[PDB]
Design a protein around this ligand. Structure first.
Ligand SMILES: C[C@@H](c1cccc2c(-c3ccc4c(c3)CNC4=O)c(C(=O)O)[nH]c12)N1C[C@]2(C[C@@H](CN)C2)OC1=O
Ligand SMILES: [Zn+2]
Ligand SMILES: [Zn+2]
Length: 232
């Protein structure tokens, strides 16, 4: 009823959308992994009379449900998708998207890691993102590679029309005491990568983490704090 959705308000196997700004939504789904249930976010950005999708809904069935929820709530076709790193909460569902006619994209680093680890593989490579601080335009967003953080390949996404910063899993929610799933992380570089985000997007008004509730710019400093404390 208007609050940001959590696992407790998403019916089993379903997806919810949340309006972030004009022409910007997040998508929220839930998935089980190693015997625990987690929420995860993605982004939808209006691209004229089409939509750009950022990240899958963490699984094939969740991603089919995402497409159906978009059709119900928005009614414009998803034509392209970008996955912001190689983990299943970002690429699981790419096969569903590709068979629905969505063109799927990721950096070459993400594509290599997905292939090596047995995750679904976006079709198209995003060049121009291989050095920290790199940025490229992609429809109504800017894609930015901040450096290694949650993963070595993680990208962030900025919506300049709305000053929305989608940090993906490199950014944690304010209520998080934990640095999340750090299996593939670089804890030593993560604060430096967050500092690059902070420097590049000082006018961000909304910051969306890969999991949990959006907030403001404080999510960036909070993330650096929790990662340093985890490392400590
Ligand atoms: C698919 C993804 C994954 C699976 C399960 C939970 C999470 C979390 C995560 C978020 C937030 C909280 C926690 C956990 C705990 N409390 C939190 O608030 C994150 C994140 O932090 O983004 N991601 C997760 N995977 C798998 C894996 C392990 C690797 C193969 N051995 C691949 O790494 C990874 O991220
Ligand atoms: Zn991840
Ligand atoms: Zn994640």
């Amino acid at each position: 009823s208007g609050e940001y959705p959590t696992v407790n308000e998403i019916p089993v196997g379903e997806v919810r959308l949340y309006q972030i700004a004009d022409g910007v939504w997040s998508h929220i789904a839930t998935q089980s992994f190693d015997g625990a249930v987690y929420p995860s976010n993605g982004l939808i950005v209006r691209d004229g009379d089409e939509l750009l999708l950022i990240d899958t809904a963490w699984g094939a069935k969740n991603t089919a449900a995402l497409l159906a929820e978009i059709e119900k709530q928005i009614g414009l076709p998803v034509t392209r998708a970008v996955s912001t790193h190689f983990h299943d909460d970002r690429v699981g569902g790419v096969d569903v998207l590709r068979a629905a006619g969505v063109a799927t994209y990721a950096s070459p680093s993400t594509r290599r890691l997905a292939e090596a680890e047995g995750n679904e593989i976006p079709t198209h490579s995003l060049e121009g993102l291989s050095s920290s601080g790199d940025a490229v335009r992609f429809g109504p967003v800017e894609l930015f590679y901040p450096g290694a953080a949650h993963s070595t390949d993680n990208l962030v996404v900025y919506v300049p029309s709305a000053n929305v910063l989608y940090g993906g899993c490199a950014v944690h929610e304010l209520s998080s005491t934990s640095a999340g799933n750090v299996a593939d992380a670089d804890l030593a570089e993560w604060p430096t990568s967050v500092e690059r985000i902070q420097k590049h997007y000082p006018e961000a008004e909304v910051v969306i983490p890969g999991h949990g509730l959006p907030g403001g710019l404080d999510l960036l400093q909070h993330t650096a704090n929790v990662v340093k404390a985890h490392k400590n």
